[PDB]
Nucleic acid binder design. Structure first.
Lengths: 218, 129, 88
RNA sequence: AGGAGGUAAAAAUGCCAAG
RNA sequence: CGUAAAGCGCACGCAGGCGGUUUGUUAAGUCAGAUGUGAAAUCCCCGGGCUCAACCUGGGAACUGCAUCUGAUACUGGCAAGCUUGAGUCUCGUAGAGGGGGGUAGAAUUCCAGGUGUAGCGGUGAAAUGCGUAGAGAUCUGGAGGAAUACCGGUGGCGAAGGCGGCCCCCUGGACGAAGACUGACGCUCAGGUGCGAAAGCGUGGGGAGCAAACAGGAUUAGAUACCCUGGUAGUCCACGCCGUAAACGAUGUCGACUUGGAGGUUGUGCCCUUGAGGCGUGGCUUCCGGAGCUAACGCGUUAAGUCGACCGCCUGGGGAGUA
């Protein structure tokens, strides 16, 4: 049942037929989700998220969508977790040993152009050191305090971040994805039927999981 | 033109388990309701029932253990183009005896293991290992 | 063809009553009336190959019903074929 | 979005090469 | 067996194979048991003997079979009675280049005649052959002919396939739908058989505008028996026979069942507020994309090349050869 507003269903008539278990077809040719079928779904996910947090896990907050990037940043930063919000680099989990080389360049440049040599050289390449830093701080921004692999992933759209999902189950990492009526639920280990592209919907989703992980340090 | 209703029954179970349908309905028959009882007592299906009086409807609720079917294979051995009868001593063991073969003996349909200890053979219907 | 009152004449002659319209004696007689009617059509045109395929379908369907009727009830079969003049 | 054209829209010839 | 070799061009069908559902009966198939037999030797098993082994030998099993007897009756068959879903009939409508016959319409090409009118026309990459002062081409009027049906026109429709486009009538086939009634398994497939079967071709008799094999002339070219140009007979058209082939192709046999979806086209129909082009359903046919699955891959994908069943056709390295 609605503890909130807009999380009821979306995205059109056209739909993934693997999510027929969580649907009502509304009169505006827009499928709406069985909310009493997904309310026990994500509190089951909140049961497992608080357990992974209680064994001091590292939880990734992946989802870009150009309209929830600003909110998923504040989700993992209100707690002590990690996130991506700009373009998820294809390979940053399965090929993590060469993305480890790229955060070290970011962690170098956050000392080079910040406090070390920033004006001690030519002015053009000094801007290039900041130009390289500004495209590394959005791609590998929330990952520089990692240094292992994450213990879980929290995706906000499954069909838009299938690359992250395919990389997660290619390892042993479980996922908690907010799947929508057009997205695929088979790659997901903890299917959460809900709206994906609504800013009030996601702040309920990221707000609940950031609240759930910040009882995990007890 | 529907010349084997028994192979149509196993095909509906096979396609129903592949499509992850929870239940399979088919036109009932006295032989279909017999070999459905063999699958229910052996653990391949659950809770078969017959609804109807003049055009009865056999309905079987399929079985799943984890995200996978229970009947991995369900073949039909004595099709109407080629009937297969076996004696008592050459009744087949299917998948080394951990999958059954439905044989129609003169004491009704039973598994191959049941027909050996009963001591008689008959027309073998299906390998539902 | 075989207009609606002409079929009404046949269905009352051969069946039990007027709504009895699907029995073998009715259908065999009803096809034979159409087959005999189309003889004048093909004594004429003779190159209507597309319409003759419908005629051979009516001939072969009549023979299948008579071969059904001779197996079930040979009394009604011999009464039927003398009633229309069949069995060459 | 499909349709039609546009000094314009082509069409002259142009073979062979071996273990 | 889509493309590697391989689905008859397509139907209709006899023999044949197969057959929905319920009860009874029969006990042929089937199953169980027994009896007789299945020669001995070999083969196999457990033994015995040659100093071991080969070899020899005792006993047993086996000889998968056949026949009779006595049982079993689930399945298959037989017989009897049914049942309604398969198949079929009737009533009522709908759509359609389905077929056969007979009429008729307008546009254009060519020819014929005439008026006007003046040196070109036609053609090409460019030319020439050709046509034109005997007056063409252009234009206008009148006529005679034959053939094809612009626009509609649409991965639109219909047909078993080949195929089928102006309009109108006559004769006629099939499909589909709604709501009922009726028959009661009448079904599916089909070797041989029979029928249909583009175009080219053949026979006889017509017809002949336009195109056009052959052929001729002009070009092009090293040559040009070609492409290109100017002509042009058979043929293309009609009637009636014949041929019986095609990349006759979705290179995919027919029939039935089952198995996520999306966007369309087309043609029915139900219900509701038709209130208005809507809304909700439900059938038939059809195009495209795509999931599982399948596939060597390409791809196919509820119209399967998926999962199955019934029957048929066919394939077995390339060439020789679909030839003698």
């Amino acid at each position: 049942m609605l503890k909130a507003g807009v999380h009821f269903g979306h995205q059109t008539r056209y739909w993934n037929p693997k999510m027929k278990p969580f649907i009502f077809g509304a009169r505006n040719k827009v499928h709406i989700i069985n909310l009493e079928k997904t309310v026990p779904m994500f509190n089951e996910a909140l049961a497992e998220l608080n357990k992974i947090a209680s064994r001091k896990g590292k939880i990734l907050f992946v989802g870009t969508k150009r309209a929830a990037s600003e909110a998923v940043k504040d989700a993992a930063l209100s707690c002590d977790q990690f996130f991506v919000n700009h373009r998820w680099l294809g390979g940053m989990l399965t090929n993590w040993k060469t993305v480890r080389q790229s955060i070290k360049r970011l962690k170098d440049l956050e000392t080079q152009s910040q406090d070390g040599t920033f004006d001690k050289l030519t002015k053009k390449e000094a801007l290039m050191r900041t130009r390289e830093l500004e495209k590394l701080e959005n791609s590998l921004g929330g990952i520089k305090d990692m240094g292992g692999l994450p213990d879980a992933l929290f995706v906000i759209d499954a069909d838009h971040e299938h690359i992250a999902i395919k990389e997660a189950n290619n390892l042993g990492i479980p996922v908690f994805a907010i799947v929508d009526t057009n997205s695929d639920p088979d790659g997901v280990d903890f299917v959460i039927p809900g709206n994906d592209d609504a800013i009030r919907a996601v702040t309920l989703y990221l707000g609940a999981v950031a609240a759930t992980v910040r009882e995990g340090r007890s | 033109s529907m010349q084997d209703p028994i192979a149509d029954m196993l095909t509906r179970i096979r396609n129903g388990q592949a499509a992850n349908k929870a239940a399979v309905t088919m036109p009932s028959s006295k032989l279909k309701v017999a070999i459905a009882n063999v699958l229910k007592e052996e653990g391949f299906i659950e809770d078969f029932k017959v609804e109807g009086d003049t055009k009865p409807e056999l309905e079987l609720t399929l079985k799943y253990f984890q995200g996978k079917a229970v009947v991995e294979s369900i073949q039909r051995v004595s099709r109407p183009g080629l009937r297969i009868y076996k004696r008592k001593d050459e009744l087949p063991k299917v998948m080394a005896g951990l999958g059954i073969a439905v044989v129609s003996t003169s004491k009704g349909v039973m598994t191959d293991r049941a027909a050996r200890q009963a001591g008689l053979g008959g027309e073998i219907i299906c390998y539902v290992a | 063809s075989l207009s609606t009152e002409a079929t009404a004449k046949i269905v009352s002659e051969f069946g039990r009553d007027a709504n009895d319209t699907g029995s073998t004696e009715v259908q065999v007689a009803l096809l034979t009336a159409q087959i005999n009617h189309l003889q004048g059509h093909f004594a004429e045109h003779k190159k209507d190959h597309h319409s003759r395929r419908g005629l051979l379908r009516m001939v072969s369907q009549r023979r299948k019903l008579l071969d059904y009727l001779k197996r079930k009830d040979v009394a009604r079969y011999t009464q039927l074929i003398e009633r229309l003049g069949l069995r060459r």
